[PDB]
């Protein structure tokens, strides 16, 4: 009945996790989990109590299972990678270092193929995939010889990078792709040999893949990265997540899409075409989801089952080849990072805030008036909110209308059409009288002739700069500067602003004086250093104007 | 409620957790646990599981004390807590913490055996962490430790309490102060000493670096937002005596804060604008939690026990959207009402889309503005000196800018947000030229501006 | 204005010139209180004989179907301003032709007081309604224990305007509408439209039951026509006017012209006879001076074995010959007429001398051989 | 202002809708017109404007004695003018009629 079941929940810091590293894997009932903490979790699947409970030291930021052996590895961040038989004879267990294989230490990321093992491990610039043998009798679980090492001479570095396990048709805790497409990305080497290929999500979000077969090196025999390991496509943020679905569906599935993800969600899927130059050719999509993309599992038939903090959304590429838009629904769930998908579509996922769930996807006689009310109550309850949302849209265009004519003007000012046609500063000189003394003032007009009205968020400068040629002695007063808000001005309309220049102290008026008017547009008032001024004229007062007969 | 045959509630993982003491007759009161779950079929609660746990001693006064989840710092699972007090007569007051399991099983860690009672702040935190206050004297019990311990700092209230990213358990008592609970005692970033006066609960939401953004609730019925300290976003809150805040979630972004009152009313508020989207009255209690399993937060609300001697009997559960349930044909208008009420969530969720849309042009469109009109740093930087009624604006220079080829000033220009009128603000500027350790060598030339004050002081404030 | 510097902002208020050479204009048009996203880039001159136009995916889905006008559009146009004028209309058209998708009513008024006023009604009255709202369709009885259906077409605002109200009987329903009046005031209007109407409906009614009614088969209501059967291969077609049904009709026969002149003859002499007291049945009766055959053929009614486009048997030596292989159609053809309507069509495709191409009436494969 | 013989767009002062301080205080802390008149005998105005400046007898000349003293009273003397709206000093309008 319930869409939606909880398991547990969990020791969440404030908000809750962070991504790249959190994981959850199920088995069959049986149920795999980290915190991105020091505690990796199984969960009986029939009644979500605990069957083990795992304490390493220091931070696991990956699980994978191999299932017919029954053993469970992790990496632990500043240690190496370890190792547990599930069987495994407080239902807290601590490690003992016993279980400890390759304490590699600088070892981040790390896949799993049949019986081969490969880590890309942390250096200076260089990161460097190594690639080791995995023994396939029941022994001591040991990591026997280094096959292989390369450096992803490309990549010179909170986001983990991601390794994929990619096998082509015929030949695993990975993913089938069809000939194809394998033939298309990865060429024929891998084709021929039937090599699987291992694909590197990195932080730069270069995404890289290398063919295993051409991985054996020796000391002599130095793996060349140049040629030796290549990059697909430069999703321009990080990696996030890599898969492969089966579009057109009419365990082992023989999948046919390629599927990466962005952090930002500049999603990219890849097909074959085999069209209009009668040649196969790849299919390239970059969508833009979204949001902060948090993590991304795949379901049955072409269905990706991804999240961003807002809630939790769904893609469909089962449909020129494959689409114009992913415009995506949610389930209504939140921002669940670390997601899984099982196919039988029944998911599992941890919610951001501490927990884990389990979605699992699919007349009355005054009972029907009750589902009336509710629905009526409901379409109540939103009719608010679309309101709300509704004014704020009104503001915002209110903004760009005055925007507009800001702009408007701004471009009719900065062309020199001959007349300063929209706004006008004429200044003009006056002598008054006060106290005693005659005094010498500026009269400052401002005028619209043009239809824009200079509305709220605009003002004048007046600067009134004194004689130039600065001295060997720096005066008291170099300048006045006086600021005035110009509110609704209007067309055709006016204002009129004195001053004084005139001998305040000392009987000292020095000519000849520049008065500069100026314009400002203010952002912030209607609604890295952000505004602009705009010249209008700058009038010189020379003595001629200051004589009196 | 607190008492020997009487109940308190919770939420756990969707469902509903009702612990009731009861007189069992051979000997004493038993801790019953029923744990309900919705049925959304026949839109009631359903018994799914029961617990016991049997007290020994034959004394009076057991008493639940508080309930929540809380997270153990052994496995780190959410669990839920809860504290018994035992009270003897003696003036003795024994404060068990048990721990309940997936099994609806009990499991003692604190007997923590104190004479004199505990009251007031009472605050459950991680590692399943007891933390109470008597005459000014903050006291912890640890589950680690098993030792009573003193907070070695003197505060008036401690208003927040919860762990936090590097530090690992913290308080905020006098919004300066930010302890630790072993090391006792950044609070660079917090709310002003102004509002220290008002503030009677705080909410942080989030921590980055120290920069939180946090909420407030006051005495004077207000509500808050505050971004590195910034009090953005009032509201106003309809009732008296605010208690608390939670989170709610809505689905996509519809987060609101459910606010609770001593006045047994509360409200709920939308965030994207800070405003009461409802109230509702005498609210025996409130818990948000997915109770349907839908994948996302609800809202519980309990009506009084005047109804029944029964707890779960005039319930109200609601996201506030979708979702409503409570306690001659027509259906032809069934598949229509639906659609609509689903096409008019699409409008909600596809509005939100465009609002940012618009936002997102007009920022595009400024600096549009400001590459229409037009690298290297001309000026140092801004400082700004009060002296008696006068202003003293200034700038340090670069020696890129040449006073000898360029005649410079600098204005002030006010905020209209502020000014609703047109006061003309007039300036003097001066250059200064100060050589630094005479006896190339470095000259200082600085710009600065001069103006009155008490005319801009008119709105207690001013940008 | 006259200039496109103001009149521009006046009819495109959201429009933003970004770069100062006014070339890359950017944000919203108007149309149907709704605003849509749109970057228009210009040469370096003001010419849009070459431009780039591009749309959100909501626009680009709203002006399917049209995709060659705004393309045509471009390059014809002298101005922007009135290439925005073209494409605001253009866009008004597009969502009014496309008005099935796009509703956001206003709901505390509209879905509420429907539920209220059809709570005033009663819920037996209600048949029909679409998921959209838009549609309803009712039922009124006659004091006889007849029903009479009504569809109502409801807009955004139900009670601000009209509702248009589409409805069988045979004259034009009027209906006072004010803002104060409901679905009960045009209710009463179409109780009062059943209880006036009534002699017409009994007159119909009685000739349904009694007679061999042909060319109408399970007749509806605006059905004025009654095509009688009497005798054998010889029909009477008989158009009643509705307001005095009981008075004369213009009637006459059809069939063989030694088998038609008796009766147009006795017609002519026994009509002074008619009186609009009795019924058309008991005037018919005394006037032809016969009683009719009640279904003297019910199952064979009549297949009109006739062309089905020209509607007539013998158009030039040609009979009725080609088929539909169909059991619902069975419609017969003329070779000429359904070669010259299949003809046309786009659907139908010519082989040597074969044309296969839809059925007029069924849309199904039908095939000529000339 | 109105009536002034440039006939130039003089912008509306509109003297301060509060005081510096009252605003002040509120944000720390968070209808008919008026009339008088009056009658005077025409006797009395004849005689006591006779000297007899010109014009035509009372209202205008009554007026333009009532305002002598301020400096817009030619341009009413020209106009002959027995009813005006000027402002105030404080931007309170008031129209006073003879
Ligand atoms: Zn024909
Ligand atoms: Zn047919």
Redesign the interface.
């Given at each position: 009945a319930p869409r939606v079941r909880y398991l547990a929940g969990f020791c969440c810091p404030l908000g809750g996790l962070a991504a790249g590293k959190p994981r959850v894997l199920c088995h069959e009932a049986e149920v795999f989990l980290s915190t991105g903490s020091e505690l990796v979790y199984v969960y009986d699947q029939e009644g979500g109590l605990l069957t083990a409970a795992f304490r390493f030291p220091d931070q696991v930021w990956h699980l994978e299972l191999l299932a017919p052996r029954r053993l469970l590895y992790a990496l632990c961040a500043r240690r190496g990678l370890y190792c547990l038989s599930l069987d495994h004879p407080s239902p807290v267990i601590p490690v003992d270092p016993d279980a400890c294989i390759l304490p590699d230490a600088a070892l981040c990321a790390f896949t799993l193929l049949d019986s081969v093992l490969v880590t890309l491990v942390q250096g200076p610039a260089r990161w460097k995939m190594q690639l080791f043998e995995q023994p396939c009798p029941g022994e001591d679980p040991r990591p026997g010889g280094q096959i292989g090492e390369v450096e992803l001479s490309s990549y010179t570095p909170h986001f983990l990078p991601v390794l994929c396990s990619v096998s082509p048709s015929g030949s695993s805790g990975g993913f089938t792709l069809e000939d194809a497409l394998f033939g298309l990305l990865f060429g024929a080497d891998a084709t021929l040999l039937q090599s699987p290929v291992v694909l590197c999500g990195l932080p730069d979000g270069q995404l890289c893949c290398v063919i295993l077969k051409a991985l054996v090196t020796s000391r002599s025999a130095p793996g060349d990265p140049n040629a030796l390991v290549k990059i697909l496509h430069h999703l321009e943020e990080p990696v996030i997540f890599i898969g492969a679905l089966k579009t057109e569906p009419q365990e082992d599935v023989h999948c046919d899409c390629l599927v990466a993800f962005g952090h930002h969600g500049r999603m990219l899927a890849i097909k074959a075409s085999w069209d209009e130059s009668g040649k196969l050719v790849p299919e390239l999509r970059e969508y833009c989801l979204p949001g902060p993309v948090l993590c991304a599992a795949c379901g049955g038939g072409g269905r990706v089952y991804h999240s961003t903090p807002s809630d939790l959304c769904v893609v469909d590429l089962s449909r020129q080849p494959e689409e114009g838009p992913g415009g995506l629904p949610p389930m209504l769930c939140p921002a669940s990072l670390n997601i899984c998908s099982v196919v039988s579509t029944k998911l599992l996922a941890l919610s951001a805030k501490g927990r884990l769930m389990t979605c699992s996807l699919d007349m009355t006689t005054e009972s029907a008036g009750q589902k009336i009310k509710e629905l009526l109550s409901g379409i109540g309850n939103i009719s608010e909110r679309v309101s709300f949302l509704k004014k704020a849209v009104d503001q915002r265009n209110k903004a760009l209308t005055s925007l507009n004519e800001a702009m408007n003007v701004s471009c009719a000012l900065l062309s020199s059409g001959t007349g300063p046609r929209p706004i006008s500063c004429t200044t003009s000189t006056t002598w008054s009288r006060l106290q005693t003394q005659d005094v010498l003032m500026a009269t400052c007009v401002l005028e619209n002739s043009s239809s824009f009205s200079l509305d709220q968020g605009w003002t004048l400068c007046i600067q009134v700069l004194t004689s130039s040629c600065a001295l060997d002695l720096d005066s008291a007063c170099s300048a006045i500067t006086y600021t005035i808000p110009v509110d609704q001005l209007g067309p055709g309309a006016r204002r009129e602003v004195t001053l004084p220049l005139g001998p305040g102290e000392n009987g000292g008026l020095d000519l000849p004086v520049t008065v500069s008017c100026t314009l400002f547009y203010s952002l912030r008032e209607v609604v890295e250093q952000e505004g602009v001024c705009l010249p209008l004229s700058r009038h010189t007062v020379d003595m001629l104007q200051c004589l009196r007969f | 409620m607190s008492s020997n045959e009487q109940e308190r509630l919770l939420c756990y993982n969707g469902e509903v957790l009702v612990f009731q003491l009861s007189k069992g007759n051979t000997k004493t009161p038993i801790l019953h646990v029923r744990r309900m779950v919705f049925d959304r079929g026949t839109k009631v609660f359903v018994q799914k599981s029961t617990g016991f746990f049997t007290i020994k001693e034959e004394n009076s006064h057991l008493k639940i004390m508080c309930c929540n989840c809380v997270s153990d710092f052994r496995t780190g699972i959410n669990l839920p807590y809860i504290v018994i007090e035992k009270n003897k007569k003696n003036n003795v007051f024994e404060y068990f913490l048990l721990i309940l399991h997936s099994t609806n099983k009990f499991e003692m860690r604190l007997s923590f055996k104190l004479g004199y009672e505990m009251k007031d702040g009472l605050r459950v935190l991680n590692g399943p962490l007891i933390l109470w206050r008597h005459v000014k004297a903050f006291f912890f019990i640890s589950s680690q430790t098993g030792k009573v311990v003193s907070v070695s700092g003197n505060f008036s209230s401690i208003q927040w309490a919860g762990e936090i990213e590097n530090l690992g358990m913290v308080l905020l008592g006098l919004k300066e102060c930010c302890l630790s609970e072993e090391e006792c005692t950044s609070d660079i970033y917090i709310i002003p000493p102004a509002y220290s006066s008002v503030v009677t609960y705080v909410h942080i939401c989030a921590t980055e670096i120290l920069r939180i953004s946090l909420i407030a609730l006051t005495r004077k019925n207000q509500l808050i937002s505050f971004q590195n300290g910034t009090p953005k976003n009032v509201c106003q809150l309809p009732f008296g005596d605010p208690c608390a805040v939670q989170l709610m979630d809505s689905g996509g972004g519809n987060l609101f804060f459910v606010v609770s009152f001593i006045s047994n009313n509360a409200c709920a508020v939308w965030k994207e604008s800070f405003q009461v989207a409802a109230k509702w009255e005498k609210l025996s209690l409130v818990l948000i939690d997915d109770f349907i399993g839908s994948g996302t937060e609800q809202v519980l609300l309990l009506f009084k026990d005047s109804l029944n001697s029964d707890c779960l009997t005039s319930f109200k559960i609601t996201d506030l959207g979708k979702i409503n349930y409570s306690s001659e044909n027509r259906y032809l208008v069934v598949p229509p009402l639906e659609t609509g009420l689903k096409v008019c969530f699409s409008s909600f969720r596809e509005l939100r889309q465009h609002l940012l849309l618009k936002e997102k042009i007009i920022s595009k469109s400024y600096k549009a503005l400001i590459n229409l009109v037009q690298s290297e740093q001309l000026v140092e930087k801004i400082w700004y000196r009060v002296i008696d009624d006068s202003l003293v604006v200034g700038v340090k220079t670069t020696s890129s800018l040449k006073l000898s080829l360029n005649d410079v000033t600098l204005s002030l220009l006010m905020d209209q947000a502020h000014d609703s009128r047109f006061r003309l603000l007039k300036c003097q500027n001066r250059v200064i030229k100060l050589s630094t350790n005479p006896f190339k060598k470095e000259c200082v030339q600085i710009i600065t501006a001069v103006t009155s004050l008490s005319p801009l002081l008119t709105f207690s404030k001013f940008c | 204005?006259a200039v496109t510097?103001?009149s521009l902002?006046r009819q495109c208020?959201?429009?933003?010139?970004?770069?100062?050479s006014?070339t890359?204009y950017?944000?919203?048009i108007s149309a149907q209180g709704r605003?849509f996203?749109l970057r228009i880039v210009l040469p370096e001159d003001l010419q849009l004989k070459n431009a780039r136009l591009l749309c959100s995916?909501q626009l680009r889905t709203i002006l399917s179907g049209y995709h060659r006008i705004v393309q045509q559009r471009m390059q014809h146009s002298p101005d922007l301003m009135s290439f925005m004028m073209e494409l605001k209309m253009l866009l008004e058209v597009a969502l009014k032709n496309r008005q099935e998708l796009y509703?956001?009513?206003?709901?505390?008024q509209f879905?509420?007081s429907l539920?209220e006023e059809?709570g005033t009604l009663g819920?037996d009255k209600?048949?029909?309604?679409?998921?959209?709202?838009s549609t309803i369709k009712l039922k009124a009885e006659d004091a006889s224990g007849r029903e009479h259906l009504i569809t109502l077409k409801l807009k955004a605002k139900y009670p601000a305007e009209s509702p248009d109200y589409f409805v069988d009987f045979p004259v034009p329903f009027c209906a006072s509408w004010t803002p104060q009046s409901s679905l009960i005031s045009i209710y009463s209007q179409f109780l009062a439209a059943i209880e006036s109407l009534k002699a017409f409906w009994d007159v119909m009614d009685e000739i349904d039951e009694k007679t061999w009614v042909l060319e109408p088969e399970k007749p509806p209501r605006s059905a004025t026509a009654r095509r009688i059967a009497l005798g054998n291969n010889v029909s009477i077609n008989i158009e009643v006017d509705p307001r005095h049904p009981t008075m004369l009709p213009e009637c006459f026969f059809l069939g063989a012209d030694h088998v038609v002149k008796p009766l147009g003859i006795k017609l002519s002499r026994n009509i002074h006879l008619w009186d609009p007291e009795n019924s058309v049945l008991q005037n018919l009766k005394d006037v032809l001076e016969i009683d009719f055959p009640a279904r003297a053929i019910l199952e064979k009614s009549d297949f009109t074995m006739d062309c089905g486009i020209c509607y007539a048997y013998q158009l030039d030596g040609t009979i009725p010959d080609q088929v539909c292989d169909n059991s619902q159609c069975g419609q017969p053809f003329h070779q000429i007429c359904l070669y010259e309507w299949l003809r046309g069509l786009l659907t139908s495709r010519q082989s040597f001398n074969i044309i296969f191409g839809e059925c007029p009436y069924c849309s199904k494969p039908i095939t000529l051989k000339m | 202002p109105g009536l002034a013989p440039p006939h130039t767009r003089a912008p509306s002062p509109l003297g301060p809708t509060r005081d510096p301080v009252a605003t002040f205080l509120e944000t720390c802390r968070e209808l008919p017109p008026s009339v008088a008149s009056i009658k005077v005998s025409a006797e009395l105005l004849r005689a006591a404007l006779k000297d007899g400046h010109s014009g035509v007898p009372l209202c205008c000349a009554t007026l333009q004695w009532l305002l002598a003293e301020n400096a817009a009273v030619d341009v009413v003397r020209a106009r002959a003018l027995s009813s005006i709206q000027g402002v105030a000093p404080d931007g309170a309008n008031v129209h006073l009629i003879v």
């Open positions: - | - | 204005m510097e103001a902002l208020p959201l429009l933003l010139p970004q770069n100062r006014k890359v950017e944000g919203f605003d996203h995916w509703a956001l009513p206003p709901p505390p879905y509420s539920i059809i819920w209600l048949v029909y309604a679409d998921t959209c709202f | -």
